[PDB]
Design a protein around this ligand. Structure first.
Ligand SMILES: O=C(O)CNC(=O)C(=O)O
Ligand SMILES: [Mg+2]
Ligand code: NI
Ligand SMILES: [Zn+2]
Length: 331
C-alpha cells in the first residue's frame, strides 16, 4: 500500500507531465497521495497562470463576510456577518490597515501560534465565494476554468445525462480569515490555486479517519450535533491542532504559497487560515474513483447548508433514497 502513514505529498510535474490533468491526478493517486486527503502541486517553472496581477483592483466583492467567532481559542464556531460591497482595491487597503494587517512574526510557525492563540478576539473580513477566474484564456495547462465538468464525468461513468454547470470561485483573504472543518459537497475533490499574496495554512484528516473527526466534533459541539446529523456541512466549526492532538485525531498540516496548487481528495476534511492579503481560485472536480464517495456522502437536510443548483442532480441520481428529505431541506 503506497503512503500508509497518510502524509501530505508534494509533486513537481515537468511541463510534459502538466499537459494531461486527469492522467496526473491518477498518477498522484498511484503513489498514495489521496491517503493524506490533501496534496501540493508545484507547477513547472515554464508555466504561468496569467501575465500579471496588476489589473485586478476593480473586481467587486459584492458581499464581504465578517467572520465572528464564539467559543474558546481552540474550539470555536464562526458566523458570517454580511458587509457592504467593496472592490478588491478597497479590500486590499483594508487588509493592510493597522486593524487587520498581519503582526510581526518570526516565521510560519510563530504566525501559526499567534493565529491559534488570538483568532477568536478578532473578526477578519473574507471575500469568499466570488464566481469568476483569474486564469488567462491562453493558459492551456491546469486552467481551473477549463476543466472537464463533474456532469460530464457522471455521464461518462454512469451513462446518465444531467443538468448543471461547474465554474470556479475566487477567494480574497486577509490575516486570520478562516475556512472551517469540512469536506466538499458530495465529497468531491477540490483544486485550489493561490494566485498572489500571502500564504494559506491547511490542516487535513486522512479520508480513512474522517469519522474520528466527526465523532470528536459531535462531542465538542453537542447542540449543533443534535440539530443536524451532518452539521460539519454548515462549515462553521473550528478545532485547533492542539485539541486534535489531545484527542488522538490523525491529521497533517502544510502551508501553501503563491504559485502553488493544492488538491483535496474525496472525504478529506480540511480547515485553515490566511496569513495576510491573498487571492485564491478553487473549483470542485470528479474522477472515476469519486463515484463511490458521492454515493455514500452525508447530507445536511436541516436547512442550514443550502448549496448550488448543480448538487440537485448529484443527490437525485447517486442518492435517490435521500433525495426527497434533502430537497425539503433545500426548500
Ligand atoms: O481557501 C479557502 O478559503 C477554502 N478552500 C477550500 O476549502 C478548498 O479549496 O477546498
Ligand atoms: Mg480589475
Ligand atoms: Ni474545501
Ligand atoms: Zn444541517
Amino acid at each position: 500500500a503506497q503512503n500508509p502513514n497518510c502524509n501530505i505529498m508534494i509533486f513537481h510535474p515537468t511541463k510534459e507531465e502538466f499537459n494531461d490533468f486527469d492522467k496526473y491526478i491518477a498518477y498522484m493517486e498511484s503513489q498514495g497521495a489521496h491517503r493524506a486527503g490533501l496534496a501540493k502541486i508545484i507547477p513547472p517553472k515554464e508555466w504561468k497562470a496569467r501575465e500579471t496581477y496588476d489589473n485586478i483592483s476593480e473586481i467587486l466583492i459584492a458581499t464581504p463576510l465578517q467572520q465572528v467567532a464564539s467559543g474558546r481559542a481552540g474550539v470555536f464556531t464562526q458566523y458570517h456577518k454580511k458587509k457592504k460591497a467593496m472592490t478588491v482595491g478597497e479590500y486590499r487597503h483594508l487588509a493592510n490597515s493597522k486593524k487587520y494587517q498581519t503582526p510581526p512574526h518570526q516565521n510560519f510557525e510563530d504566525l501559526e501560534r499567534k493565529y491559534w492563540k488570538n483568532r477568536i478576539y478578532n473578526s477578519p473580513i473574507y471575500g469568499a465565494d466570488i464566481s469568476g477566474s483569474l486564469f488567462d484564456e491562453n493558459t492551456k495547462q491546469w486552467n481551473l476554468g477549463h476543466l472537464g465538468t463533474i456532469q460530464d464525468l457522471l455521464e461518462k461513468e454512469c451513462g446518465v445525462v444531467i443538468e448543471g454547470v461547474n465554474t470556479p470561485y475566487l477567494y480574497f483573504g486577509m490575516w486570520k480569515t478562516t475556512f472551517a472543518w469540512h469536506t466538499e459537497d458530495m465529497d468531491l475533490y477540490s483544486i485550489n490555486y493561490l494566485h498572489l499574496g500571502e500564504p494559506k495554512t491547511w490542516y487535513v484528516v486522512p479520508p480513512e479517519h474522517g469519522q474520528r473527526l466527526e465523532r470528536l466534533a459531535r462531542e465538542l459541539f453537542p447542540g449543533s450535533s443534535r440539530g443536524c446529523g451532518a452539521f460539519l456541512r454548515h462549515k462553521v466549526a473550528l478545532i485547533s491542532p492542539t485539541v486534535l492532538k489531545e484527542n488522538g485525531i490523525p491529521f497533517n498540516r502544510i502551508t501553501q504559497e503563491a504559485g502553488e496548487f493544492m488538491v483535496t481528495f474525496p472525504y478529506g476534511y480540511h480547515a485553515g487560515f490566511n496569513h495576510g492579503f491573498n487571492c485564491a481560485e478553487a473549483i470542485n472536480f470528479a474522477t472515476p474513483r469519486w463515484i463511490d464517495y458521492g454515493k455514500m456522502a452525508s447530507q445536511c437536510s436541516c436547512g442550514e447548508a443550502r448549496v448550488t443548483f448543480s448538487m440537485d442532480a448529484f443527490v437525485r441520481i447517486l442518492q435517490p433514497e435521500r433525495y426527497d428529505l434533502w430537497k425539503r431541506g433545500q426548500d
